[PDB]
Amino acid sequence: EVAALVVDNGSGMCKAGFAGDDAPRAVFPSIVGRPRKDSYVGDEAQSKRGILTLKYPIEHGIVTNWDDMEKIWHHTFYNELRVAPEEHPVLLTEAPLNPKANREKMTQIMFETFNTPAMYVAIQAVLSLYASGRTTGIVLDSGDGVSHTVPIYEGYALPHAILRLDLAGRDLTDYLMKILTERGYSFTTTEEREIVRDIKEKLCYVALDFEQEMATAASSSSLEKSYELKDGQVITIGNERFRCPEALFQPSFLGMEACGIHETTYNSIMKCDVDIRKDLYANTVLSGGTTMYPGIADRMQKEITALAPSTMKIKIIAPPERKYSVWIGGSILASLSTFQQMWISKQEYDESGPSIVHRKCF
Ligand SMILES: C=C1[C@@H](C)[C@H]2[C@H](Cc3ccccc3)NC(=O)[C@]23[C@H](OC(C)=O)/C=C/[C@@](C)(O)C(=O)[C@@H](C)C/C=C/[C@H]3[C@@H]1O
Ligand SMILES: Nc1ncnc2c1ncn2[C@@H]1O[C@H](COP(=O)(O)OP(=O)(O)OP(=O)(O)O)[C@@H](O)[C@H]1O
Ligand SMILES: [Ca+2]
Ligand SMILES: [Ca+2]
Numbered sequence: 001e002v003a004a005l006v007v008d009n010g011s012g013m014c015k016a017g018f019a020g021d022d023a024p025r026a027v028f029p030s031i032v033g034r035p036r037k038d039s040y041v042g043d044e045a046q047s048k049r050g051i052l053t054l055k056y057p058i059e060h061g062i063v064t065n066w067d068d069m070e071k072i073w074h075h076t077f078y079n080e081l082r083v084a085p086e087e088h089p090v091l092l093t094e095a096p097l098n099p100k101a102n103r104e105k106m107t108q109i110m111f112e113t114f115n116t117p118a119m120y121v122a123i124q125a126v127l128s129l130y131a132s133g134r135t136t137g138i139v140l141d142s143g144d145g146v147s148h149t150v151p152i153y154e155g156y157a158l159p160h161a162i163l164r165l166d167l168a169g170r171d172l173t174d175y176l177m178k179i180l181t182e183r184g185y186s187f188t189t190t191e192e193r194e195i196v197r198d199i200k201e202k203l204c205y206v207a208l209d210f211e212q213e214m215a216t217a218a219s220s221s222s223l224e225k226s227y228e229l230k231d232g233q234v235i236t237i238g239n240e241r242f243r244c245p246e247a248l249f250q251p252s253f254l255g256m257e258a259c260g261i262h263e264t265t266y267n268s269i270m271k272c273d274v275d276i277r278k279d280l281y282a283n284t285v286l287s288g289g290t291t292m293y294p295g296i297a298d299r300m301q302k303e304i305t306a307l308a309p310s311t312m313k314i315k316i317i318a319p320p321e322r323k324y325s326v327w328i329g330g331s332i333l334a335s336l337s338t339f340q341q342m343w344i345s346k347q348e349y350d351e352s353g354p355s356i357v358h359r360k361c362f
Contacts (some may be wrong), residue, residue: 011145
């Protein structure tokens with residue numbers, strides 16, 4: 001056979017490549033644009049913001065507009081990867097606990113619209129655990145539009161213990177824009193949002209102790225970092241560096257009543273059979289671009305520890321390439337001998353119909 005194609009659809013970015021590679025061949029923005037050709041996808045859809053009405057097909061992880069998603073996939077196949085989908089089995093990723101109806105539309109589009117010889121849909125968080133080389137653990141997947149905690153035991157996810165936190169990279173990006181603005185600068189436009197997203201990714205970090213970090217930055221300049229704008233203006237970022245990602249642990253800074261990532265992780269563990277909570281505590285795996293902040297692991301360690309029984313062994317695993325662990329796990333799974341029997345063949349589709357997805361996929 002040829003290569004399966006691994007397509008990781010995200011809320012902000014989409015990752016695509018060939019099973020067997022250790023990194024996705026292409027990564028582009030999850031946006032489609034039409035007149036305010038007929039449509040535009042990715043970076044070129046943004047540079048035409050003023051003349052195009054932009055839409056975001058994947059919000060908070062769920063596909064909300066199928067015509068748009070279909071265009072993202074068409075763009076992924078012909079423009080990005082430059083392959084014929086009918087000559088490749090396709091593995092798509094999806095968010096945990098998504099509408100059963102969605103899973104059927106994904107299958108249908110892949111077969112009836114792209115004529116894929118075979119496809120499959122897999123929960124992102126599970127792929128990340130596989131990427132870490134485990135079959136048991138609790139993954140904290142945090143991206144650009146949504147965050148989930150997914151307990152997995154012996155290779156299978158535990159639906160009833162999965163939680164969803166609507167706080168991720170996009171919220172943090174805007175929050176950084178707001179505090180720097182309060183600082184004396186002015187970041188409010190979509191063009192500027194792209195700039196603050198870059199600042200956030202390069203100079204932000206999670207303090208081990210908020211207050212102490214605040215005190216150190218209020219009486220010293222030791223934590224300050226300079227950032228240069230394209231036009232040459234140099235701006236300094238002080239406590240914003242850590243105050244921004246702090247919103248993950250304290251959503252209230254954003255007017256949100258939901259509990260932080262550490263507490264949400266703990267809550268997923270408690271929803272699990274007491275017999276496996278230990279395995280989960282010693283195997284808390286970070287995933288997604290938003291778990292990339294320097295210092296986040298040691299902070300998760302300290303916070304989880306404070307929540308769990310004193311006799312509990314805590315361990316936070318923060319893979320270096322966790323910004324793509326989902327896609328990678330997909331690359332790994334698609335090539336698994338034991339996984340081949342899971343693909344949904346076009347034959348299995350013609351006979352059983354779209355509903356075949358609930359049998360082999362879930
Ligand atoms: C990557 C996924 C699948 C490959 C399954 C995977 C186990 C597996 C691996 C290789 C070959 C066969 C099965 N681990 C899971 O949680 C899956 C596996 O799905 C199947 C069909 O086993 C688990 C299913 C349940 C019932 O546990 C679910 O939680 C279900 C609601 C969501 C789907 C989970 C599946 C996940 O998307
Ligand atoms: N080094 C970094 N530090 C902090 N944040 C980062 C870093 N690198 C990337 N990010 C953020 O990670 C987010 C993108 O992560 P990812 O691609 O995993 O999410 P997604 O799949 O696009 O969306 P979601 O999974 O929520 O549906 C963006 O907010 C990006 O700015
Ligand atoms: Ca994702
Ligand atoms: Ca609070």
